[PDB]
Amino acid sequence: DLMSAESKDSLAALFSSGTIVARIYCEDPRNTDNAWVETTCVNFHDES
Amino acid sequence: ISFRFSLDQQATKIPINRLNSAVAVHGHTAEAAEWYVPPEEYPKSGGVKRYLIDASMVPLSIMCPSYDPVEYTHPSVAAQPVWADPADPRKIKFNVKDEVNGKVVDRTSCHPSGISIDSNTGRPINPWGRTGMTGRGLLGKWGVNQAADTVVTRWKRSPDGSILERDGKKVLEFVAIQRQDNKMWAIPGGFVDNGEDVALTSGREFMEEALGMGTSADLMSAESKDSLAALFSSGTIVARIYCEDPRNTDNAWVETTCVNFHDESGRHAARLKLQGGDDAEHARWMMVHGGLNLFASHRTLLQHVTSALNAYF
Amino acid sequence: ISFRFSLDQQATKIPINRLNSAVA
Amino acid sequence: SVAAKTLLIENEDGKGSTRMEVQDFMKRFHMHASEDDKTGSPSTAWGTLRFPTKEATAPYLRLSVNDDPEDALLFVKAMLAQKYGETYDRPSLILSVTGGARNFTLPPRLETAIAKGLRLAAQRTNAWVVTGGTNTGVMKLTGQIMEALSKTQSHFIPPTIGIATYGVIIGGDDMTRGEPPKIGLEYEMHKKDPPKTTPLDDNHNLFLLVDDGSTNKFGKEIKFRAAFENAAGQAFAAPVVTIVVQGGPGTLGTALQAVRQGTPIVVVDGSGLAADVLAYAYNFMHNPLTRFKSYTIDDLRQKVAQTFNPKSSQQLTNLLDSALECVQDPNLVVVYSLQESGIDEFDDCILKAIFSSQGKLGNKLKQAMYFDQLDVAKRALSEASKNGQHNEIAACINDNLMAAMMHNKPHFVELYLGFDAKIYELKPSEEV
Amino acid sequence: SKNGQHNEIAACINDNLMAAMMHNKPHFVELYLGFDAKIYELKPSEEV
Ligand SMILES: Nc1ncnc2c1ncn2[C@@H]1O[C@H](COP(=O)(O)OP(=O)(O)OC[C@H]2O[C@@H](O)[C@H](O)[C@@H]2O)[C@@H](O)[C@H]1O
Numbered sequence A: 001d002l003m004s005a006e007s008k009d010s011l012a013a014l015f016s017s018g019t020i021v022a023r024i025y026c027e028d029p030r031n032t033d034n035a036w037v038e039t040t041c042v043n044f045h046d047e048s
Numbered sequence B: 001i002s003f004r005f006s007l008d009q010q011a012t013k014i015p016i017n018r019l020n021s022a023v024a025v026h027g028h029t030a031e032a033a034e035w036y037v038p039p040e041e042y043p044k045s046g047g048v049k050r051y052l053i054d055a056s057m058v059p060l061s062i063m064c065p066s067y068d069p070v071e072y073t074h075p076s077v078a079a080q081p082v083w084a085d086p087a088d089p090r091k092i093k094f095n096v097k098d099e100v101n102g103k104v105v106d107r108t109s110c111h112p113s114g115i116s117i118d119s120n121t122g123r124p125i126n127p128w129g130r131t132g133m134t135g136r137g138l139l140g141k142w143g144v145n146q147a148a149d150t151v152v153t154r155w156k157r158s159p160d161g162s163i164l165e166r167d168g169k170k171v172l173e174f175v176a177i178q179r180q181d182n183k184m185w186a187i188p189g190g191f192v193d194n195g196e197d198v199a200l201t202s203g204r205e206f207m208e209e210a211l212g213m214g215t216s217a218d219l220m221s222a223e224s225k226d227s228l229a230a231l232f233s234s235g236t237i238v239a240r241i242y243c244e245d246p247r248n249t250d251n252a253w254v255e256t257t258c259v260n261f262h263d264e265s266g267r268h269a270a271r272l273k274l275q276g277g278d279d280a281e282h283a284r285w286m287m288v289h290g291g292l293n294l295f296a297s298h299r300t301l302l303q304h305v306t307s308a309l310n311a312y313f
Numbered sequence C: 001i002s003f004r005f006s007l008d009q010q011a012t013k014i015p016i017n018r019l020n021s022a023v024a
Numbered sequence D: 001s002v003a004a005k006t007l008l009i010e011n012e013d014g015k016g017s018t019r020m021e022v023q024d025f026m027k028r029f030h031m032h033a034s035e036d037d038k039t040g041s042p043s044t045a046w047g048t049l050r051f052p053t054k055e056a057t058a059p060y061l062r063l064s065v066n067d068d069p070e071d072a073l074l075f076v077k078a079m080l081a082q083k084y085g086e087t088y089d090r091p092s093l094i095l096s097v098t099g100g101a102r103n104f105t106l107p108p109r110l111e112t113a114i115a116k117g118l119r120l121a122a123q124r125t126n127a128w129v130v131t132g133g134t135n136t137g138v139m140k141l142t143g144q145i146m147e148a149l150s151k152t153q154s155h156f157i158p159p160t161i162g163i164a165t166y167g168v169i170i171g172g173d174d175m176t177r178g179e180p181p182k183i184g185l186e187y188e189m190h191k192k193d194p195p196k197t198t199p200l201d202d203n204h205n206l207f208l209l210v211d212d213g214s215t216n217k218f219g220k221e222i223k224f225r226a227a228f229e230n231a232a233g234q235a236f237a238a239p240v241v242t243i244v245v246q247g248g249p250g251t252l253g254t255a256l257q258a259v260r261q262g263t264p265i266v267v268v269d270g271s272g273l274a275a276d277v278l279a280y281a282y283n284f285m286h287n288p289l290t291r292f293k294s295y296t297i298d299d300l301r302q303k304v305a306q307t308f309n310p311k312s313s314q315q316l317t318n319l320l321d322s323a324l325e326c327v328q329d330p331n332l333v334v335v336y337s338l339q340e341s342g343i344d345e346f347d348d349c350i351l352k353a354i355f356s357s358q359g360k361l362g363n364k365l366k367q368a369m370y371f372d373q374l375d376v377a378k379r380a381l382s383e384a385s386k387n388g389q390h391n392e393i394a395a396c397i398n399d400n401l402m403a404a405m406m407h408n409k410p411h412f413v414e415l416y417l418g419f420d421a422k423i424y425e426l427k428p429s430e431e432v
Numbered sequence E: 001s002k003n004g005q006h007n008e009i010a011a012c013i014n015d016n017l018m019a020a021m022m023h024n025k026p027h028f029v030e031l032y033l034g035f036d037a038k039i040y041e042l043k044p045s046e047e048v
């Protein structure tokens, strides 16, 4: 279902402060010699 | 439990790598055309209405061939008092400190581009955008009307003496006056007089408006004068911004220097006898938060005060 | 109450932009 | 019953009452025939209403919003002075009960606790209770409380004044048409009328129908009600205590007017809706306890949006601003929680609201004597003793000692005698 | 009581009061009767 206007505001407030903590190579079992997964990791920390 | 909470927020909370994912929630809704356009009806003018413009049509860089502002000057300003500039603004030098009748007037704007002078009539052009109305209106000086605002602050404390804390930050309290003209609460302050600086003006407007001590009550005691002087001896200029004042026109706009007098101990602030005087009706201590509905851009000024003091907002 | 006062002054109190309004 | 031709109205000097004709006194009250009308016409709608299963009749007055609250106060004083003589029991407390008219839906245990607190406060202080005049919600509940109060009393019955906006009353058309003294007009709550649907409460002892030329519009009587209570408070030198239980948007406006006129309010936390909104706002702005440190303006805005349903950002901003404006002065708001705090601490909250005012110092000690709170009086006297103010204490100590003697409170008698109240320097209230 | 949920409390208060009567727990009987359990609105488990 559709989110409420305060739930949308709360989720937007949570998502407005994100820090890229790492950009590493994944140890993913689907990786091959010609296709591999590389991840950008985004941390959304809720201090309060 | 209060100490446990206090130690926990002092140990957990003490451009580069910063990402905004609000677009996933909202979509096409973002910060678009965040620009101030004053209301259609000019205050205290007897029904003269501006030329209505959309908020995306305000800045000078954007083209506007259908711009037809109304020329209006208030009768009080047109009657020529001591604080009003002459009706023909030629021979007046803008962007530098100018001497009128041997008294210094600032006339310099905080805008990086500066004030541009119209070649046909010599009147200044507002660099902060269009307001749909030319002439001086209620403002007495062509160009920058320098205002000084006085935010006298103290920490909001309970009867036990502990400072009130909301959202992990200490809570402030500022002296606010209720304006005579539009009856909305505001920071005490007024226009900078001729030949005087922001230092005298900020203090003078706070005594006249917040305390009502401008020839209207009684002479202060020697310890009350010493306490008020001690309060006023440590002030920090927190911001110098453009006011979102409804009296602003294309040829006269208010720019404020904001002075914060913070009372850390709270001794000097408690000796103030608040009583609205001059162009203020009532004065009271009011909690600083982000939901305040104040006159002009005083919420931005309070944001600057709380940013400087690491207070709640 | 002494500790409350001590933590409050250690967290609130830890030429350029300085103005003197004592002349008013 | 012989209809009155002359009435005894008390003078503006407060020294005696002069007798004058009823049509001369009633000329100062106006009615609006339509919204467009401003000056108005003479009202001519006053008299007595007879309710089924009620022995006594209840007065009604249709007045205009621009009318002076002192004149309406003179009208209430003149009727009571006519019926019970000059020496009728004057109120030492005005208790305003406001809140939800229709949306009020509360658990029975909570209702009994609130009812118990109101019944004891009213019975101990001989209070005049001013609520809304309609037969719904908290007004009906307060009416039931004063209905039970009206049986154990022998001589003096405290008025239950109902102030309601005229134009929503089903018997409004039947009251206005006719001769000016309408003696004993029958009020029919079950009678059908297509436009209006709100009947008067049968347990209220008096009715002020405030009219502004409006059919089916509510909240027009709020400013006059706050002003009338404030006027009554100044006239009898009695504290006015507003009590807020649940409530909608007009209750918020009632509390806002009450806090603007200097009248303290008592907000019942835990009853839900506007009372929870007001309590949340006060606790966010003033309460130093640990559990209120997570309180935010955003959660308050969420509560206002979920409760009032403003349907627009500007309306929500105005409601939030009004709610924050109510709890600006911490002295004028006292928050009582129904659930966490005790059952018999509601009168302490009412007394704290009384004590939070500025003047009526003799009267505040009298209220402390009525509620049997010896410690509150002792602390006030000790603080007063430390703070100098010897003239006001000596001026009111005799009357307080006299009052303590009249109401059989020996502990208060010993306490007042210990604080330099000469036993042989007492004075009677009237002149022999 | 604080958390709303009036329908489920009213739906189970009668059966709880009935159960309290069957197992001889008078304190529970007074406690359930104080929380809006109408004494004359009890219902038996089986059908006569
Ligand atoms: N340059 C001027 N322009 C207009 N009025 C002036 C001026 N100088 C003096 N005045 C006089 O001062 C009166 C205004 O009172 P003040 O307290 O001096 O000014 P105020 O109305 O408070 O306006 C300044 C307020 O506006 C905000 O933008 C700014 O932050 C400040 O708070 C006016 O009625 C006018 O008579």
Ligand SMILES: Nc1ncnc2c1ncn2[C@@H]1O[C@H](COP(=O)(O)OP(=O)(O)OC[C@H]2O[C@@H](O)[C@H](O)[C@@H]2O)[C@@H](O)[C@H]1O
Pocket: D097, D098, D099, D100, D101, D102, D103, D104, D131, D132, D134, D136, D164, D198, D218, D219, D222, D247, D248, D249, D250, D251, D252, D254
């Ligand atoms: N005094 C009233 N009597 C009867 N019905 C009313 C009243 N005021 C409003 N109503 C209608 O009843 C509905 C529910 O009202 P509530 O939200 O329960 O209460 P509120 O709207 O705050 O009005 C309560 C009223 O009580 C008085 O103490 C106070 O003056 C306030 O006007 C509203 O939609 C309104 O149309």
Ligand SMILES: [Mg+2]
Pocket: B188, B189, B190, B205, B209, B279
């Ligand atoms: Mg000013």
Ligand SMILES: [Mg+2]
Pocket: B189, B190, B191, B205
């Ligand atoms: Mg000024």
Ligand SMILES: [Mg+2]
Pocket: B189, B190, B205, B208, B209, B278, B279
């Ligand atoms: Mg001024």
